[PDB]
């Protein structure tokens, strides 16, 4: 199928700061990926983002009913919906499962990686640190970054590029909003 | 900010595909099954706490269709440029033999929002147990999408997520096997 495609998108966005104390509403219209016109509650009228949106900004701004409907949206739409969903979204906390295991960059090498796999957590903000004998290791740390699973959970793998020695104690430490103190998992080469 | 809730809509010609969904910080709260006129909560628990009148979404999509006609003309029928997806396959947890896990196929950074996605096990299509999300919005106004396959890890099976998109010259296969 080589027929040309044409796409219209609309995004009605509610941005919340400090709960519902400060709220910003955006009414955004797109042709393909190009935003062409927008209502920003900081302004209180539509503004053309590209020339394509000029006729809409001009006509919509001439209609006081449209403007007042949009100007009230921070309250009647944003604050309302926040109240409806906050208990299972804003308040959602799922603690991470943490696993540590050794690995090798190439298959016939001796272990030269330690992997800290942090799985199943929500929300996304997380801090993962490596320690060797109680001292933080900052050199040779690499990660997948934050991975969204698409199902209201996240995961991340954080690797330490080191060759485990007998007698060493390695610790992966995880900080996350669902936890009241850091979660630590220890790993030893002769464990 | 602290949180963002987005009601995201699209309408696509000539496919006549429309979608309506709510997003919270990058996760889907719900979408409307436009054919069945039903609200589909992303997590089942969500629907015990909130409701949404699915019927209402049809009106928005109808406006978006009308607006698309208007904008198509304004642009002198300038069509969308295909942006092919980045595709990644991962498991949701560390793999152990004979311990149930889930394969995730992540299809990202693409437009238009039309794709054919197939799970392959040992080169053969799998349909048992599979699930998927609708097209999810990105801040750059492209799309992303997830497909899922629950599985029992074994040394004998190999998997591929096969993705077809008009921006690709051939189907993209992303492989996974144990180890």
């Amino acid at each position: 199928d080589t027929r040309p495609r044409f796409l219209e998108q609309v995004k009605h966005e509610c941005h919340f700061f400090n709960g519902t104390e400060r709220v910003r509403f955006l009414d955004r219209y797109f042709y393909h990926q190009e935003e062409y016109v927008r209502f920003d509650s900081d302004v209180g009228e539509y503004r053309a983002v590209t020339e394509l949106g000029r006729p809409d900004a001009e006509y919509w701004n001439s209609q006081k009913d449209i403007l007042e409907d949009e100007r009230a949206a921070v309250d009647t739409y944003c604050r309302h919906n926040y109240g409806v969903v906050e208990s299972f979204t804003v308040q959602r906390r799922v603690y991470p499962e943490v696993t540590v295991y050794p690995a090798k960059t190439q298959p016939l090498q001796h272990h030269n990686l330690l992997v800290c796999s942090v799985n199943g957590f929500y929300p996304g903000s997380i801090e993962v640190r490596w320690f060797r004998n109680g001292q933080e290791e900052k050199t040779g740390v690499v990660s997948t970054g934050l991975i969204q699973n698409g199902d209201w959970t996240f995961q991340t793998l954080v690797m330490l590029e080191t060759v485990p020695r007998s007698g060493e104690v390695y610790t992966c430490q995880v900080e996350h909003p669902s936890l009241t103190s850091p979660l630590t998992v220890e790993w030893r080469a002769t464990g | 900010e602290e949180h963002v809730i987005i009601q995201a809509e699209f309408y696509l010609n000539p496919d006549q595909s429309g979608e309506f969904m709510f997003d919270f910080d990058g996760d889907e709260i719900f979408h409307v099954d436009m054919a069945k006129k039903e609200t589909v909560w992303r997590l089942e628990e969500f629907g015990r706490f909130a409701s949404f009148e699915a019927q209402g979404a049809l009106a928005n999509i109808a406006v978006d269709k009308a607006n698309l006609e208007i904008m198509t003309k304004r642009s002198n029928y300038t069509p969308i440029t295909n942006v092919p997806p980045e595709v990644t396959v991962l498991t949701n947890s560390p793999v152990e033999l004979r311990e149930p896990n889930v394969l995730i196929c992540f299809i990202d950074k693409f437009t238009p929002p039309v794709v054919n996605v197939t799970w392959l096990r040992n080169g053969k299509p799998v349909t048992t147990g599979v699930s998927e999300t609708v097209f999810l919005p990105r801040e750059d106004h492209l799309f992303r999408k997830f497909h899922y396959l629950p599985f029992l890890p074994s040394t004998e099976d190999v998997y591929d997520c096969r993705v077809e998109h008009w921006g690709l010259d051939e189907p993209l296969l992303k492989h996974w096997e144990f180890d």
């Binding site: 009605h12 009414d27 949206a73 009647t76 309302h80 | 909130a50 978006d64």
Partner: peptide, 13 residues
């Protein structure tokens, strides 16, 4: 409670 939709505004023909 019920989630409210925001209407999409019809453009100029």
């Amino acid at each position: 409670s019920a989630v409210r939709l925001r209407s999409s505004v019809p453009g100029v023909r």
